[PDB]
Amino acid sequence: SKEYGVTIGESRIIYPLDAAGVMVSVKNTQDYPVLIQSRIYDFVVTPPLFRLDAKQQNSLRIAQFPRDKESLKWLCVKGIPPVGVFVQFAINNCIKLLVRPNELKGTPIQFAENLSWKVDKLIAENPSPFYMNIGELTFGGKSIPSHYIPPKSTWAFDLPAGARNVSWRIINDQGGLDRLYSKNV
Amino acid sequence: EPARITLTYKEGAPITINIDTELLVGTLTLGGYKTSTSVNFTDAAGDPMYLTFTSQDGNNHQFTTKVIGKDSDFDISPKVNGENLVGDDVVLATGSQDFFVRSIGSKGGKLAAGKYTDAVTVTVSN
């Protein structure tokens, strides 16, 4: 057997718009050295590539848009290790980088309950300025492969027998599950 | 809360030469995550839906494999080079999810004994 692992010190970054920077720790939890390769997708990450030894942790700096709404990027952190079949893997651990204006006054959980639902697909409506990063979602007591709902917007889910109850939990800023909300549609 | 992701690769049985289809090449356990579409296995060949293994003798003998799994008993699959081979998007099992790397075949055929390799990136979008 072969083992792989990359740990990022947080599961999301809330990045205050125009702030100087934030720090995130990365750990190589394995017994061999890796190169850590860090990227932002749709900001600088220093260092973008560096050697991280077995069992060691280091730190990355993330440094800087709409002013009414959050914006979303991804930080991805990859550990590159050093008929017969031989396969090598590398984990590329990606987390949400949520760019949040100071003007926005609150957090996502204050607006979690405001999600409204329609069928037309199961369509969620988000009147808040935040991404609603839903971590758990059901309809008719049936599980729906989940996704975030963008700020001031909607998102459409494929439907999974006449039942009309939607329940959801967003994922909060600390990466925890938020309270269960429930509504008839 | 940290975002930890792990992978474990357990090797399957030896493959003997055409090779048989649906052979269990090996088993992957992905763990640590807090959906199947959030996981993408990629390689240099970049063939949609399959991971490609290439010989090391400079003759460019290739075969393909799929990556598949079972949900709480529908067939499911992560993205492989950006696309799903079977199933709808589903939530992964709590804690960890097993995926089976299974042989397809050789488009060219005429394989030779020896070592075949692939380098696979596993991207997870938490």
Curated annotation (Swiss-Prot), chain A:
Disulfide bonds: 76-94
GO molecular function: protein folding chaperone
PROSITE patterns, per database record: PILI_CHAPERONE
Pfam family, one: PapD_N
Keyword terms of this UniProt record: Chaperone, Disulfide bond, Immunoglobulin domain, Periplasm, Plasmid, Signal
GO biological process: cell wall organization; chaperone-mediated protein folding
Record-linked Gene3D superfamilies: Immunoglobulins
Transmembrane spans: none
DNA damage among keywords: no
One Gene Ontology CC term in the entry: outer membrane-bounded periplasmic space
Subcellular compartments: Periplasm
Role of this protein: Has a stimulatory role for the envelope antigen F1 secretion. It seems to interact with the subunit polypeptide and to prevent it from digestion by a protease.
PANTHER family xref list: CHAPERONE PROTEIN CAF1M, PILUS ASSEMBLY CHAPERONE
Family as reported in the entry's similarity comment: Belongs to the periplasmic pilus chaperone family.
UniProt-recorded name of the protein: Chaperone protein caf1M
UniProtKB/Swiss-Prot annotation, chain B:
Keywords of this entry: Capsule, Plasmid, Secreted, Signal
Keyword Secreted: yes
Compartments, as annotated in UniProt: Secreted, Capsule
Predominant location category: secreted
GO BP: cell adhesion
Keyword Secreted: yes
Annotated GO CC locations: capsule; extracellular region; pilus
Region annotated Contains potential antigenic determinants that may stimulate T-cells, chain positions: 58-107
The protein's name: F1 capsule antigen
Organism: Yersinia pestis
